[PDB]
Amino acid sequence: IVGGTASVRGEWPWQVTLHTTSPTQRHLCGGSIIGNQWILTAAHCFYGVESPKILRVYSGILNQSEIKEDTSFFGVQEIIIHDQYKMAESGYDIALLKLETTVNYTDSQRPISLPSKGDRNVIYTDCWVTGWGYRKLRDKIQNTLQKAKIPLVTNEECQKRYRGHKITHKMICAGYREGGKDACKGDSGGPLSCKHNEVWHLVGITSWGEGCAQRERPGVYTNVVEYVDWILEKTQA
Ligand SMILES: COC(=O)Nc1ccc(-c2cnn([C@H](CC3CC3)c3ccc(-c4cc(Cl)ccc4-n4cnnn4)c[n+]3[O-])c2)cc1
């Protein structure tokens, strides 16, 4: 997260850190708890991943340095990538992780609601991106979960900024005209969370952008409301 600030413990309890363990253990991407056995993340995250055997899901983490050899994690039973995914910039950048066991919800690990049926025309004005990613284009994974409030931009404006890409209704963009706050490397798969009527909704999944927090170059997110039918089909199969 560029231009963000440190989170406190328990502030974003749906946020998980997905680790790979090959060839060494490290944060791979963010993700969001959406059900007791289900993490929603980005399909791009699994580009180098030989199987779910090497993945670990850590919940209730504020600092990456909390994770030691005895820290509990969830194994991953299945990675479900959207069958039309090819690369992040061409859309369908969405994946479900089915966990090997059920999360018991606590103060530190809670689900976030999907965008609600009937809310297709809500104007979200309180949206936040969170993650352990870089604070600038050449940086390092951050120890403490970072947060930044970021305004949504219309798909019409977003397309005008990304003349070489096809911005579709299955994407949503967010960014300041003058830059300065954005997701960056290591934030992908994490949530774009928006609060509406005091309820948090998983509006976006961090996906791609041209650089990090550049002027007139918004971040591009998977538009989760357009995948609710796909999520429900996979999670009640
Ligand atoms: C200690 O372990 C470590 O070093 N871990 C570690 C280090 C680096 C990485 C890393 C690098 N790339 N990515 C991803 C995609 C890869 C499949 C993971 C990525 C790409 C683009 C964006 C992004 C998103 C938005 Cl919305 C806006 C702008 C951008 N960006 C444009 N240009 N950069 N970002 C964010 N992410 O995350 C993650 C992962 C783990």
State the burial class of residue 95 (Cβ atoms within 10 Å of its Cβ: 0-12, 13-18, 19+). buried
CATH at 90 = 2.40.10.10
* Structure-determination technique: X-ray
What are the φ and ψ backbone dihedral angles of 41, each rounded to 5 degrees?
Answer: -150, -170
CB 205 within 8 A of CB 41: yes
Peptide bond into 23 cis (omega under 30): yes
Determine the Cα–Cα distance for residues 7 and 61; give it in Å rounded to an integer: 11
Q: Which of these, 113, 197, 204, lies nearest to 151 by C-alpha position? A: 204
**Chain position carrying tokens 């680790």:** 19
CB 39 within 8 A of CB 96: yes
CB 46 within 8 A of CB 93: no
Resolution of the experimental model in angstroms, please? 1.8
For 27, the domain range is 15-111+228-236
Determine the Cα–Cα distance for residues 234 and 136; give it in Å rounded to an integer: 36
- The pair of three-digit structure tokens given for residue 230, joined into one six-digit string: 């796909």
- CA-closest residue to ligand 1 atom 26: 219
Q: Is 201 a catalytic residue?
A: no
- Show the ligand 1 pocket: residues with CB < 6 angstroms: 26-29, 44-45, 47, 133, 141, 182-188, 206-209, 211-212, 219-221
